[PDB]
mmCIF file of all heavy atoms in Angstrom:
data_model
loop_
_atom_site.group_PDB
_atom_site.id
_atom_site.type_symbol
_atom_site.label_atom_id
_atom_site.label_comp_id
_atom_site.label_asym_id
_atom_site.label_seq_id
_atom_site.Cartn_x
_atom_site.Cartn_y
_atom_site.Cartn_z
ATOM 1 N N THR E 71 4.136 -10.882 5.162
ATOM 2 C CA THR E 71 4.475 -12.305 5.378
ATOM 3 C C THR E 71 3.351 -13.207 4.840
ATOM 4 O O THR E 71 2.156 -13.002 5.190
ATOM 5 C CB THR E 71 4.712 -12.585 6.853
ATOM 6 O OG1 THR E 71 5.844 -11.844 7.310
ATOM 7 C CG2 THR E 71 4.919 -14.082 7.006
ATOM 8 N N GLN E 72 3.740 -14.167 3.995
ATOM 9 C CA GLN E 72 2.917 -15.279 3.441
ATOM 10 C C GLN E 72 1.805 -14.819 2.501
ATOM 11 O O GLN E 72 0.980 -15.673 2.086
ATOM 12 C CB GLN E 72 2.360 -16.124 4.578
ATOM 13 C CG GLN E 72 3.351 -17.200 4.975
ATOM 14 C CD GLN E 72 3.663 -18.119 3.814
ATOM 15 O OE1 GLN E 72 2.826 -18.900 3.385
ATOM 16 N NE2 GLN E 72 4.866 -18.011 3.278
ATOM 17 N N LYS E 73 1.784 -13.557 2.100
ATOM 18 C CA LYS E 73 0.807 -13.158 1.078
ATOM 19 C C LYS E 73 1.291 -13.530 -0.328
ATOM 20 O O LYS E 73 2.522 -13.448 -0.622
ATOM 21 C CB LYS E 73 0.544 -11.666 1.222
ATOM 22 C CG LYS E 73 -0.154 -11.317 2.549
ATOM 23 C CD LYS E 73 -0.768 -9.920 2.607
ATOM 24 C CE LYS E 73 -1.873 -9.682 1.594
ATOM 25 N NZ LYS E 73 -3.013 -10.647 1.739
ATOM 26 N N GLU E 74 0.353 -13.903 -1.175
ATOM 27 C CA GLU E 74 0.576 -14.228 -2.600
ATOM 28 C C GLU E 74 0.385 -12.979 -3.469
ATOM 29 O O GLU E 74 0.786 -12.951 -4.631
ATOM 30 C CB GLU E 74 -0.432 -15.284 -3.072
ATOM 31 C CG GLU E 74 -0.216 -16.612 -2.398
ATOM 32 C CD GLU E 74 -1.262 -17.631 -2.866
ATOM 33 O OE1 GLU E 74 -2.286 -17.217 -3.472
ATOM 34 O OE2 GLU E 74 -1.048 -18.826 -2.602
ATOM 35 N N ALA E 75 -0.353 -11.991 -2.981
ATOM 36 C CA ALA E 75 -0.735 -10.824 -3.798
ATOM 37 C C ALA E 75 -1.028 -9.639 -2.879
ATOM 38 O O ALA E 75 -1.729 -9.811 -1.868
ATOM 39 C CB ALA E 75 -1.915 -11.091 -4.703
ATOM 40 N N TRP E 76 -0.629 -8.442 -3.310
ATOM 41 C CA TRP E 76 -0.826 -7.181 -2.547
ATOM 42 C C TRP E 76 -0.331 -6.028 -3.405
ATOM 43 O O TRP E 76 0.508 -6.267 -4.287
ATOM 44 C CB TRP E 76 -0.119 -7.219 -1.187
ATOM 45 C CG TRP E 76 1.326 -7.591 -1.163
ATOM 46 C CD1 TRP E 76 1.825 -8.821 -0.857
ATOM 47 C CD2 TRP E 76 2.490 -6.828 -1.564
ATOM 48 N NE1 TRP E 76 3.181 -8.871 -0.954
ATOM 49 C CE2 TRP E 76 3.619 -7.644 -1.398
ATOM 50 C CE3 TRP E 76 2.681 -5.488 -1.965
ATOM 51 C CZ2 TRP E 76 4.931 -7.247 -1.635
ATOM 52 C CZ3 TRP E 76 3.983 -5.096 -2.257
ATOM 53 C CH2 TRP E 76 5.081 -5.955 -2.059
ATOM 54 N N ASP E 77 -0.821 -4.826 -3.110
ATOM 55 C CA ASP E 77 -0.287 -3.547 -3.651
ATOM 56 C C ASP E 77 0.063 -2.674 -2.434
ATOM 57 O O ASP E 77 -0.752 -2.649 -1.488
ATOM 58 C CB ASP E 77 -1.275 -2.786 -4.524
ATOM 59 C CG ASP E 77 -2.030 -3.561 -5.578
ATOM 60 O OD1 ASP E 77 -1.451 -4.503 -6.084
ATOM 61 O OD2 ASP E 77 -3.199 -3.225 -5.849
ATOM 62 N N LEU E 78 1.142 -1.897 -2.493
ATOM 63 C CA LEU E 78 1.519 -0.956 -1.421
ATOM 64 C C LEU E 78 2.061 0.319 -2.061
ATOM 65 O O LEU E 78 2.809 0.276 -3.043
ATOM 66 C CB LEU E 78 2.599 -1.525 -0.508
ATOM 67 C CG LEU E 78 2.191 -2.646 0.427
ATOM 68 C CD1 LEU E 78 3.451 -3.172 1.090
ATOM 69 C CD2 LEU E 78 1.169 -2.137 1.426
ATOM 70 N N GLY E 79 1.833 1.423 -1.373
ATOM 71 C CA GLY E 79 2.545 2.668 -1.715
ATOM 72 C C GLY E 79 1.804 3.877 -1.155
ATOM 73 O O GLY E 79 1.383 3.861 -0.016
ATOM 74 N N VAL E 80 1.699 4.940 -1.963
ATOM 75 C CA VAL E 80 0.914 6.165 -1.639
ATOM 76 C C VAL E 80 -0.003 6.501 -2.807
ATOM 77 O O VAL E 80 0.222 6.042 -3.944
ATOM 78 C CB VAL E 80 1.782 7.398 -1.333
ATOM 79 C CG1 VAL E 80 2.526 7.224 -0.027
ATOM 80 C CG2 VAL E 80 2.749 7.711 -2.460
ATOM 81 N N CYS E 81 -0.977 7.354 -2.534
ATOM 82 C CA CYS E 81 -1.820 7.869 -3.601
ATOM 83 C C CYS E 81 -2.325 9.258 -3.248
ATOM 84 O O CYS E 81 -2.301 9.683 -2.067
ATOM 85 C CB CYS E 81 -2.998 6.947 -3.884
ATOM 86 S SG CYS E 81 -4.181 6.766 -2.535
ATOM 87 N N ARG E 82 -2.805 9.963 -4.261
ATOM 88 C CA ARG E 82 -3.499 11.254 -4.053
ATOM 89 C C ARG E 82 -4.737 11.035 -3.181
ATOM 90 O O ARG E 82 -5.401 10.000 -3.293
ATOM 91 C CB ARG E 82 -3.929 11.853 -5.390
ATOM 92 C CG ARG E 82 -2.762 12.416 -6.176
ATOM 93 C CD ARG E 82 -3.213 13.019 -7.485
ATOM 94 N NE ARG E 82 -2.080 13.219 -8.375
ATOM 95 C CZ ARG E 82 -2.152 13.084 -9.685
ATOM 96 N NH1 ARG E 82 -3.293 12.716 -10.243
ATOM 97 N NH2 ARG E 82 -1.079 13.305 -10.426
ATOM 98 N N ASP E 83 -5.089 12.029 -2.380
ATOM 99 C CA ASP E 83 -6.356 11.930 -1.608
ATOM 100 C C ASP E 83 -7.533 11.871 -2.581
ATOM 101 O O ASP E 83 -8.582 11.341 -2.184
ATOM 102 C CB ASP E 83 -6.447 13.111 -0.643
ATOM 103 C CG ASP E 83 -6.518 14.492 -1.246
ATOM 104 O OD1 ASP E 83 -6.365 14.671 -2.488
ATOM 105 O OD2 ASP E 83 -6.752 15.425 -0.432
#
Side-chain angles (χ1 to χ4, degrees):
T71 296
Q72 273 300 290
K73 294 195 62 59
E74 294 179 345
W76 52 261
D77 314 328
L78 289 172
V80 291
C81 64
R82 286 181 196 145
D83 63 353

